[PDB]
Design a protein around this ligand. Structure first.
Ligand SMILES: [Zn+2]
Lengths: 718, 380, 366
């Protein structure tokens, strides 16, 4: 009955959408249009919707599509989405700014709900590409009305994740990479006011670059063609836009991909730039940015040109770290050309107006982060790092000027005079990022200044500088005098209003055992190139921190720490207990044994947990604790596993079905970990398990202290 | 002015590995009674004529929306497609009798080459039928009542029904995809034509049969369900319920080294079919409650482990499958009260599943009352 | 053109031989089993581009200027050209070596596809425009054409025709500066005219010779040598027909192409200059005989074309009467045979209503 009602609604919505499409043909007009469906005896024991202006239709259709979506869960059947997708393809054919957006969302939703049939996707795909092309002609008020929904629909249709290339028809992927490179040759991308649209184009471009199976979308040569069109568009748009960040990514990805192809070309030493002609054009763009910076002087807007130069240099440094070359080697942008750019940057800092350089300092701070990535790929020997560390502290230098550290630092003299003008423009968060890189600055260069600067950022009350210092402070202390003991100033500094500083200190503890080890070469990314766009933190940190630590057995020290850690493991926060669940298994790995002191700690924790559970009477805490006790038992191959299993049997032997179910899930988990038949793992622990069950039966006898219900209970236990 | 079909048909060979794809069909040489060699060449020439013919015609796939709705897709009648079909007819007809002979013995190489080529032809046929409704309707019309290529394809389906070797299993999954495209293309009156496929289907969904075949088979059964006469034709009324085997495959999955994704989509397809069935004594009714409990448990477990939005499409999938399964289950409770008794067998796990499911439900924005109320029925 | 996609996917353009355009895209069997599979995939990509047929819209309105009414410039066409290179050029190597027949069939099919692409696309010509050794497929084609005339094989006969036709059709649309490239064909073309070369190749030859007279660099080439001039080989083939088949409706075509060439050389403004006039006389007679015996006008369009060649021959001999004013000295030797034909055709030309007053004054001379 419900379905017949919904079907009448569907037929009415279809009549209205068809009226719209007939308006498009212009052959006839039904206005005022009253749908045949939903005529009822109640009206006259009717009044079907009446519309008289095309916009009235549009609104009726919006309402009807909303209704369809709301019922979508119950309405969707196998191939029900076919008709709905035809209706949606029509709705896209002519699209009112907002109904267009909602219909985008709707077809995307259906796509998710039942996958995408190959044939229907062609219908909608045609109109879709047409819309994309019209974007530039469209006024922002109209295109943007549905763009965001466009972006989400694209995400769903072109998800970075696996098989999203299967969803789309290969021809469609080629057409879209072809449609994208066309907008790029057009410059339409830069034209459209909304950044996220060109950003979605770049999204698709990357999706093609890295994820998609090579050639599935299109022929490899023509795909490289589209990539080159994209590069052409980007080179110009970057110089145009004040900020190239919303385009930096796609570029970086293309650069890495080109390097990948180049490496294979080389082997069955060429710069990663000279090898790729398209990357050579990118290098031309970067050189043009630098030249404009230097040549313009005051003319060029320091902010914009500096942002472009910083984007270029950041790409170069990113490739430096990520791209690896004595048969084969990869040249990189010269650090002396970097010094030229840096002379230009100093002249600009001087030229920018005090308020003007705040933007320039931001862009300069980004360029400095890129330079730091370069230093991480290859730590500059002494002087570049020196000058850098100096510049990063310039916002603090003019204030520091009268300090003992300024008296000692070698470059501090010139830095004092140079810092006043550039610092008042230096953004506080900008100088914070600078100290993040200043902390990164190695010890060899500006040693005195670097130590005193970590100490200062810890001393400074402001949170940004202190967090920057905290980041590299563990490494600093390691290098300063002792890898083993943290410094007291930082210890006091460890406590932070921001939870994130505490989680950083968790990672810092996890890193401190390595700190005892020879300090490993540090790279900001350190792996995992950043995409273009806290007790649980404590468990994460500990899992990594214990392995390096000699805690397998250690001592009272362990005992006490683990005591605190057990308190935490049973923490009021449900999510705290969870995701530490299994952190206890990682700890069993971290423990050298599951018996003795470790077993005693586990038993104490179980007693505390029984008390809390009686007090808690809360299902969520119980779920967390059950999963945790389980993971514990599963990880162990000895006595703890049967002890945890007996505690779990006690939990299972409770009136509540939920307790028994949780314990049973943990039992299945342990059996799996054991990797033996039900009867076999029974056999291993049969004596103790049945003995605990018999103790429970003696408790049940004390409870009895009628035979009918007693026997029913005993049989149910069996 | 789409020509999507033409691009699909003539392109890089659709078949991974073996390059036999319509293109070659058209260029296929004679070396590599009723099925005369010259008739083979002529089927190739016919598909080529259709290649050169489709583009010529101009057409509007659907005259009105209702009509295009019934088929669920608009097709522009390209005479070329009908010409295409004779080529598929010849290549599909080939090697069928040869397979029959291979089996009767207790000659294979020809059967093998022809079978690979025939799966190529099956995909091609999917495309060609998909684009032009006339080529379809031609096969579809019958005295009471099948196309000749349709009867040879029934033979092929018998091979699907039969115990499937590795290669034959992949071929069978291909056939099932063909069949779902067949159904969707078929008209309502042609669903009675589809009735014949039902007898083949029960063997098609078997523990031995591979997973993708089963996903496509659930889809085909769903397509069949819309027809009023077909809908009862599902369970055998205490004779083994046919649906019964599908849900059993999902409950315990033979072919365990298989993509988890396709598992999940098959299960979601059965969910969709159950909903569509709802709109339109058995051992199976008790049996169905078991697979769904297991599936909801899998999803709930996945959710408990997962934290934050579902980056993986798989996780978002569960979130959605969990809500849909909760909805189907709420009915697996309103529908039958005896339902709960046969459900008790899996109820131990199901009860644990329920609560965290309620949590995630209340959490999701896409979640609704109609979706959470469903869940409240199961857990209480 | 959308038809270009039709042509692409079409039963073997060449009559017979079992040729599949689908094999021009996907055929197992330069060699080494690598990058030729890739060429086939590239043909598939061109087919993909071809299908959509987005380019061939509204009669190629975008292109303008020279090559006006250009066959819709097609990106897909350029892509098909590479696989054709794996085909045509391979036999060219076999040709370089002192079996071949199997290669020749594929080569002929590839040449036919190349002809279609060149005719109907604005891209493969853009490849000709690229320039040398550029358009290397042209270098391969030129090698084949020169060798085709040299060696008389059953495969050689057709390949010559096809290469010539490709060259000619391309040179048609190209600019004058772009015809300075085709200049290289002029040297190789001399062998083609001789009877030993295929008659169908000799007809395409006459066509390309008319085209040459259209080109400024090709003209001088047509009468550059002190001996022969590199022209009059054509004058000699119409007069003496080296074909056993000797179908009447071929020699008329040759002479008519040549007569259009002569009228074109006139409009555009040796002992070889002398042969064209006597050959025109001979043709005026030949075209005259076919119509005279039946009487009245043409019951055949080709017969109407023979009549057109007749009228053009009288007018062209008049221009030739004004040309080398001392027409009579070189005419006398063939003068009897020419005088037999001229005045009766004068009567016939007066009979037709269409004959022009300018053609009429020409007629008046003789
Ligand atoms: Zn049943």
């Amino acid at each position: 009955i419900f379905g017949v009602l919904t079907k009448e609604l569907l037929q009415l919505f279809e009549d209205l959408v068809y009226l719209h499409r007939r308006n498009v043909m212009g052959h006839a007009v039904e206005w005022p249009v009253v749908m045949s469906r939903f005529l009822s005896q109640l009206d006259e024991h009717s009044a079907p919707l009446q519309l008289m202006s095309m916009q009235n239709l549009e609104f009726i259709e919006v309402t009807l599509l909303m209704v369809l979506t709301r019922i979508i869960a119950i309405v969707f059947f196998r191939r029900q989405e076919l008709l709905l997708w035809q209706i949606g393809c029509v709705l896209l054919e002519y699209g009112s700014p907002k109904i267009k957006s909602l219909a985008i969302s709707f077809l995307t939703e259906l796509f998710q709900l039942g996958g995408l049939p190959a044939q229907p996707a062609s219908t909608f795909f045609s109109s879709f590409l047409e819309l994309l092309k019209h974007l530039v002609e469209m006024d922002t008020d109209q295109l943007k009305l549905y763009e965001e929904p466009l972006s989400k629909l694209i995400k769903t249709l072109f998800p970075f994740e696996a098989e999203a290339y299967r969803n789309i028809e290969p021809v469609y992927l080629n057409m879209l990479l072809e449609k994208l490179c066309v907008m790029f040759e057009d410059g339409v991308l830069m034209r459209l006011k909304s950044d996220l649209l060109k950003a979605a184009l770049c999204h698709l471009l990357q999706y093609f670059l890295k994820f998609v199976p090579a050639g599935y979308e299109s022929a490899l040569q023509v795909r490289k063609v589209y990539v080159r069109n994209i590069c052409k568009a980007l080179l110009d748009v970057l110089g145009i836009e004040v900020d190239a960040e919303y385009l930096l990514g796609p570029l970086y990805a293309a650069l890495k991909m080109e390097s990948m192809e180049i490496i294979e070309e080389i082997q069955c030493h060429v710069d990663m730039n000279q090898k790729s002609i398209l990357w050579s054009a990118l290098k031309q763009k970067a050189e043009s940015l630098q030249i404009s910076l230097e040549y313009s002087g005051l003319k060029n807007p320091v902010i914009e040109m500096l942002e472009g130069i910083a984007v270029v240099l950041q790409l170069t440094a990113l490739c430096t770290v990520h791209c690896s070359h004595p048969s084969v080697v990869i040249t990189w942008m010269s650090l002396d050309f970097y010094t030229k750019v840096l002379k230009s940057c100093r002249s600009l800092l001087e030229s920018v107006q005090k308020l003007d350089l705040e933007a320039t300092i931001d862009k300069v701070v980004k360029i400095y982060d890129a330079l730091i990535y370069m230093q991480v790929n290859s730590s500059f020997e002494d002087h570049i790092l020196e000058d850098l560390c100096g510049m990063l502290s310039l916002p603090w230098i003019y204030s520091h000027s009268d300090d003992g550290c300024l008296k000692l630092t070698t470059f501090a003299a010139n830095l004092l005079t140079l810092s006043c003008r550039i610092s008042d423009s230096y953004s506080p968060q900008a100088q914070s990022r600078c100290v993040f890189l200043l902390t990164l600055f190695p010890r060899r260069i500006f040693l005195e200044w670097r130590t005193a600067v970590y100490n200062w950022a810890l001393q400074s009350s402001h949170e940004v500088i202190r967090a920057s210092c905290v980041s590299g402070f563990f490494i600093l202390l390691q290098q300063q005098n002792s890898c083993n003991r943290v410094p007291k100033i930082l210890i006091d500094k460890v406590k932070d209003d921001s939870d994130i500083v505490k989680k950083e200190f968790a990672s810092i503890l996890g890193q401190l055992v390595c700190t005892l080890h020879g300090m490993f070469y540090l790279t900001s990314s350190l792996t995992e190139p950043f995409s273009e766009h806290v007790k649980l933190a404590f468990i994460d940190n500990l899992h990594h921190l214990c392995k390096h630590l000699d805690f397998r057995e250690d001592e009272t020290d362990v005992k006490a720490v683990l005591g605190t850690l057990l308190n935490l493991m049973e923490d009021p926060d449900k999510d705290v207990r969870v995701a530490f669940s299994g952190n206890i298994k990682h700890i069993l790995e971290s423990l050298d044994s599951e018996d003795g002191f470790i077993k005693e700690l586990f038993v104490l924790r179980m007693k505390e947990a029984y008390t809390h559970a009686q007090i808690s009477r809360n299902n969520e805490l119980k779920d967390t604790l059950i999963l945790t006790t389980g993971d514990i038992g599963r990880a162990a191959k000895g006595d703890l596993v049967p002890f945890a299993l007996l505690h779990l049997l006690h939990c299972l032997l409770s009136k509540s079905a939920s307790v028994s179910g949780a314990a049973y899930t943990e039992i299945r988990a342990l059996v799996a970990a054991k990797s033996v038949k039900l009867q076999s793992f029974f056999s291993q622990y049969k004596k103790p398990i049945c003995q605990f069950l018999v103790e429970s039966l003696h408790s049940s006898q004390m409870t009895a202290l009628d035979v009918a219900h007693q026997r029913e209970m005993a049989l149910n236990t069996l | 002015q789409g020509s999507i079909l033409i691009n699909l048909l003539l392109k890089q060979p659709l078949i991974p590995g073996s390059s036999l794809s319509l293109c070659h069909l058209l260029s296929s040489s004679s070396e590599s009674g009723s099925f005369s060699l010259s008739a083979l060449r002529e089927a190739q020439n016919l598909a080529f004529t259709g290649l050169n013919l489709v583009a010529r015609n101009e057409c509007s796939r659907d005259g009105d929306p209702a009509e295009g709705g019934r088929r669920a897709f608009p097709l522009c009648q390209l005479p070329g497609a009908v010409h295409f079909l004779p080529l598929v007819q010849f290549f599909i007809g080939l090697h069928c009798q040869a397979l029959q002979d291979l089996a009767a013995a207790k000659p294979e190489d020809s059967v093998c080459i022809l079978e690979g080529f025939s799966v190529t032809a099956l995909s091609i046929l999917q495309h060609l039928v998909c684009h032009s409704g006339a080529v379809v309707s031609l096969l579809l019309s019958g005295v009471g009542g099948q196309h000749p290529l349709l009867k040879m394809l029934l033979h092929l389906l018998a091979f699907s029904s039969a115990a499937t070797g590795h290669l034959q299993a992949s071929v069978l999954t291909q056939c099932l995809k063909v069949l779902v495209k067949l159904a969707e293309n078929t008209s309502c009156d042609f669903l009675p034509r589809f009735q014949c496929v039902f007898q083949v289907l029960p063997k098609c969904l078997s523990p031995e049969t591979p997973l993708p075949s089963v996903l496509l088979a659930v889809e085909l059964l769903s397509l069949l369900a819309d027809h009023d006469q077909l809908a009862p034709q599902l369970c055998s009324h205490s004779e083994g319920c046919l649906l019964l085997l599908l849900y059993m495959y999902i409950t315990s999955r033979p072919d365990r080294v298989a993509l988890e994704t396709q598992w999940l989509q098959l299960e979601q397809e059965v969910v969709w079919l159950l909903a569509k069935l709802g709109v339109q004594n058995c051992q199976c009714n008790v049996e169905v409650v078991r697979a769904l409990t297991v599936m909801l448990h899998r999803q709930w477990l996945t959710v408990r482990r997962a934290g934050g939005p579902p980056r993986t499409d798989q996780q978002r999938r569960t979130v959605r499958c969990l809500r849909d399964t909760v909805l189907l289950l709420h009915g697996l409770s309103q529908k039958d009260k005896l339902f709960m008794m046969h459900c008790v067998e899996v109820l131990h796990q199901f009860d644990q599943v329920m609560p965290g499911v309620s949590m995630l439900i209340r959490g999701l924005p896409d979640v609704t009352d109609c979706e959470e109320a469903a869940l409240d029925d199961l857990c209480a």
